[PDB]
Ligand binder design. Structure first.
Ligand SMILES: *C(=S)NCCCCCCCCCCCC
Ligand SMILES: [Zn+2]
Length: 281
């Protein structure tokens, strides 16, 4: 069926305000973190030269990292953010949580900003893993290390290693060439059964199998894309009925949606308070 009265941000807002919109899933990527100063890599190269990679993308590939971990950790030093302050978009997802609307946030990002914004483990599928924890790569071992320990090793420019077994310690991130975490598949099996809206923000759905999540929702479930560009989705055909694309920066789009929902002040207050706290730390 068609649930939206209009294929626009305004039509989505009216639907969200209605009794029909009970469960929302967010699918998010690099675009929700760019205003937090988190690097994108969707469409950047000169910095990489000094490492002498076989090809730029090799720095995010598991095979190469295994053979030569030095480039990755040096790039992590050089691009490491000075602060970890979640964006308006993160805080909008916090509002969905607080208002009992957020069923789950599936994230491609590894920056921990969802957690910092106050989404709990239960609310999150960290599809591409996280920096929040790191593990020794040896199966018979798997010593866990926190971020505090991890960055100290990144800054000192010495490869992080397990003392116990001598082997490498890897941030719990999913490199290209690595299979995704179990939680991604277990959650995806049931989260999409009764979902009322997908909010797809800051991703062009370029990376598989994350991109396949959009097709798991019922045919009637509206899907809103907030992104720099259009990215399964039918926004523009004569058969379009449920997909809406709002093109721009994620913070601008979330501000616009919050304004339509009457949440603008609540959102602005939350961001202000939370940023002030982080600044004080
Ligand atoms: C897949 S889309 N995401 C996970 C890729 C893992 C590689 C991340 C590169 C991080 C290097 C920059 C570090 C900044 C702290
Ligand atoms: Zn170990």
């Amino acid at each position: 069926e068609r649930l939206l009265d209009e294929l626009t941000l305004e039509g989505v807002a009216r639907y969200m305000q209605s009794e029909r919109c009970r469960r929302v899933i967010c699918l998010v990527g690099a675009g929700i973190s760019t205003s937090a100063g988190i690097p994108d890599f969707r469409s950047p190269y000169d910095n990489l030269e000094k490492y002498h990679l076989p090809y730029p993308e090799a720095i995010f590939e598991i095979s190469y990292f295994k053979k030569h971990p030095e480039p990755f950790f040096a790039l992590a030093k050089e691009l490491y953010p000075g602060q970890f302050k979640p964006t308006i978009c993160h805080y909008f997802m916090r509002l969905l949580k607080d208002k009992g609307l957020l069923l789950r946030c599936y994230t491609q990002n590894i920056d921990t900003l969802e957690r910092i914004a106050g989404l709990e483990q239960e609310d999150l599928v960290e599809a591409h893993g996280t920096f929040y924890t790191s593990h020794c790569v040896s199966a018979s071992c798997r010593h866990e290390y926190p971020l505090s320990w991890m960055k100290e090793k990144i800054f000192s420019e010495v490869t992080p290693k397990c003392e116990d077994c001598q082997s490498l310690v890897k941030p719990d991130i999913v490199f290209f060439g690595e299979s995704l975490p179990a939680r991604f598949f277990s959650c995806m099996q049931s989260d999409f059964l009764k979902v009322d809206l997908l909010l797809v923000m800051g991703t062009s759905l370029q990376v598989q199998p994350f991109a396949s999540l959009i097709s798991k929702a019922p045919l009637s479930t509206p899907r809103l894309l907030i992104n720099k560009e259009k990215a399964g989705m039918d926004f523009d055909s004569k058969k379009a009925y449920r997909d809406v694309a709002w093109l721009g920066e994620c913070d601008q789009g979330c501000l616009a949606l919050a304004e339509l929902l009457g949440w603008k002040k609540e959102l602005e207050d939350l961001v202000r308070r939370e940023h002030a706290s982080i600044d004080a730390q």
